[PDB]
Structure 1
Amino acid sequence: HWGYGKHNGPEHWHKDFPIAKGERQSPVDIDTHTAKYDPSLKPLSVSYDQATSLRILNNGHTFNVEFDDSQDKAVLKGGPLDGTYRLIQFHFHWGSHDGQGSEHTVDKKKYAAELHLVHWNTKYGDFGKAVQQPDGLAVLGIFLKVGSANPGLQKVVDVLDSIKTKGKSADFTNFDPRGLLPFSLDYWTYPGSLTTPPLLECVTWIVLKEPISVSSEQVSKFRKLNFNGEGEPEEPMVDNWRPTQPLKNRQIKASFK
C-alpha cells in the first residue's frame, strides 16, 4: 500500500498518513555549524555484548535483522535518553548509486547508505505500546561511506542472496551488532519520527558523526534485493530512502564540542 515508487512513494504518503506533514518528521539535514554542544547530555552507553540475533527478512521495503527483545540483552542508555531502550531490529536505506542513499544528510551531503538500529523504551512493556509515545523509540543512525570492505557487514552481505524478494526470510543467529558501530560515539540528536509509514513521532534520533565503511562490492549486493514478491515483475530494491523534511520548531544538539 506504500512504497518508494512514483505512485506510492514519499511524496504521496501524506494522503493515508497525514502525520507526514507533522511537526517532528524525519529525516532532516544536519547543519554541523548550527548544531550546538549540549552539556546536559549524559554519556551514551551501548550494551550489546549479549545481543541475540534471530532472523533476516525482506519486508518489501528494506531488509531487517531481528533480535530477541524479550530481555535487556542489547540495550541503549544515556545520552539524551531517560531509561532503558531495547534493540528490536536493524535495517538499512541505500541508493541506486554511491552518491545517494542515506536518509539524514550532513551539510546537505548524502552518504551511500544509512544503518538504523531501532530500540524501544522498556517502561512501556512492548514495542507496540512504545511507538504510541513521544519517548517510545530511540534510533541509532550510522552512515555508510564507500571505501574498504567492512568485515562486520560481511555476514549480512553473504545471506542477502537468500532473501531476494518480498516476504523471504532466513535464519540469522549469532550476529554481533557491535561490529557495525564506529569507534567514536560522538553524535547529534533531535526529536523526530519513523522514516516510513506510519511515520509516528515517537523517536529520539541519535545520529553518529563517524561513518562506517562499505565496499562498492558490498553495497552492490544490497541493490540485488527486490521490492517485489516472487513471480512479480522485477523492481530492484534501490533508493529506499525518504528525503529530508523541514526541521520546524526543533533543535539539533551535539554530544561533542
Structure 2
Amino acid sequence: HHWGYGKHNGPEHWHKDFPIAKGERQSPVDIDTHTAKYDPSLKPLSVSYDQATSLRILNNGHAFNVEFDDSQDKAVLKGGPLDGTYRLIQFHFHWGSLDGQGSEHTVDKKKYAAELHLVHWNTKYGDFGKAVQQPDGLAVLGIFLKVGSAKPGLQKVVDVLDSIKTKGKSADFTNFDPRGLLPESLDYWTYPGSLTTPPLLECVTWIVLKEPISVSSEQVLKFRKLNFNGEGEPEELMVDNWRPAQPLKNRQIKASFK
C-alpha cells in the first residue's frame, strides 16, 4: 500500500503518511487574479536553456519525467523573484481524463487540460537532495496546457511514450530542447509553496506563467495511454495525476504584470 491518485490512496489520504500535507505552505493553489498583488520590484525571468542536455525519459509510476544533466550550469533559471542560480533537473506533466481538468493550479477556479512543471534547484545547496530541505531550495516553472492547435516542440516527447508505457521503463532521450515548450510571454505569478507529490516538502518558489501553451487533442490523448502499473500488472491508465487546490492560508500571490 503506497500513495497514488486512486480512490483508496489519492490526495485525501496522503496526510496519514505525510502529515505536512496539512501544512501552511502547500501547493497547488487557486490563483485569484483580482487579489494577486502586482509587484513592480519583481524582475523579468531569465531562462537560459541554450546549453541544456537532456538524457532520459522515465515512467516513475505517477508521471513521466524528462531528465537533464545538472552537474554543471547548462540550463538555468535566474531572475524573477529568485536569488541565485537554479539548475534544471527534470520536467514532467500533470493531466486529466478529460480536457476540462488536469492542471494543478487553477486561475479564478478555471482548470486547464494539463500543467507542465520544469523543476530547478538552487546551486548554493550543491545537490537536489539538500535543496529540498531548504525553504528556498527549488524553483518550479509552471505552464498551463490548453487543447487547440498542436505544439510542434512537444511531438518528440509524444512519439517516445509508447516505449515507456509502464512503471519503471526508461528510454534514452537526448538532444531535446525545452525552449520549444515555452509560451511567447514570460509574465508570471509567484508564491511560496510545496512539492505537489510526496514528500510534499515546503521548499518551492512557484513561478506560474500567465500565458498557456496550446496542444492538440491528439497529443494529450497520447498522455492518457500511459500506465500507472508495471508491466505484467493489471492495467490502470495514467490519468488524473493532479492534486487539488490547497488553502492559501497566510500567503500572498504576487504578479509581475498588471
Return the offset for 1:42.
1.6
Return the offset for 1:256.
0.5
Q: Deviations over 1:100-121 (max 9, x none)?
A: 0000000000000000000000
Equivalent-residue separation in structure 2 for 1:44 and 1:250 (angstroms): 21
Q: Which runs of 5+ in 1 are unaligned?
A: none
Q: Deviations over 1:130-169 (max 9, x none)?
A: 0000000000000000000110100000000000000000
* 3-state SS of paired residue (2:11): coil
Return the offset for 1:10.
0.2
Return the offset for 1:8.
1.2
Contact 2:27 2:245 in 1 (8 A): yes
* 3-state SS of paired residue (1:237): coil
Equivalent-residue separation in structure 2 for 1:214 and 1:149 (angstroms): 4
* 3-state SS of paired residue (1:238): coil
* 3-state SS of paired residue (2:116): strand
Equivalent-residue separation in structure 2 for 1:209 and 1:43 (angstroms): 13
Contact 2:45 2:80 in 1 (8 A): yes
How large is the RMSD of aligned CA atoms in angstroms? Answer: 0.4
Runs of 4+ in 1 over 3 A off after TM superposition: none
Return the offset for 1:43.
1.8
Q: Which residue of 1 aligns with 2:36?
A: 35
Equivalent-residue separation in structure 2 for 1:152 and 1:54 (angstroms): 17
Q: Deviations over 1:39-76 (max 9, x none)?
A: 11122100000000000010000000000000010000
Equivalent-residue separation in structure 2 for 1:106 and 1:87 (angstroms): 25
Equivalent-residue separation in structure 2 for 1:18 and 1:47 (angstroms): 36
Equivalent-residue separation in structure 2 for 1:18 and 1:150 (angstroms): 39
Q: Deviations over 1:8-62 (max 9, x none)?
A: 1100000000000000000000001111111111221000000000000100000
Return the offset for 1:85.
0.2
Equivalent-residue separation in structure 2 for 1:226 and 1:211 (angstroms): 26
Return the offset for 1:6.
1.1
* 3-state SS of paired residue (1:210): coil
Contact 2:89 2:120 in 1 (8 A): yes
Q: Deviations over 1:74-98 (max 9, x none)?
A: 0000000000000000000000010
Equivalent-residue separation in structure 2 for 1:181 and 1:51 (angstroms): 14
Q: Which residue of 2 aligns with 1:104?
A: 105
* 3-state SS of paired residue (2:67): strand
- In the TM superposition, 1:110-149 aligns within 5 A as 110-149=111-150
Contact 2:57 2:64 in 1 (8 A): yes
Aligned pairs, number = 257
With the length of structure 1 as denominator, give the TM-score of the two structures: 1.00
Equivalent-residue separation in structure 2 for 1:7 and 1:137 (angstroms): 30
Contact 2:55 2:69 in 1 (8 A): yes
* 3-state SS of paired residue (1:118): strand
Return the offset for 1:7.
1.4
Equivalent-residue separation in structure 2 for 1:81 and 1:131 (angstroms): 16
Q: Which residue of 1 aligns with 2:213?
A: 212
Contact 2:44 2:186 in 1 (8 A): no
Q: Which runs of 5+ in 2 are unaligned?
A: none
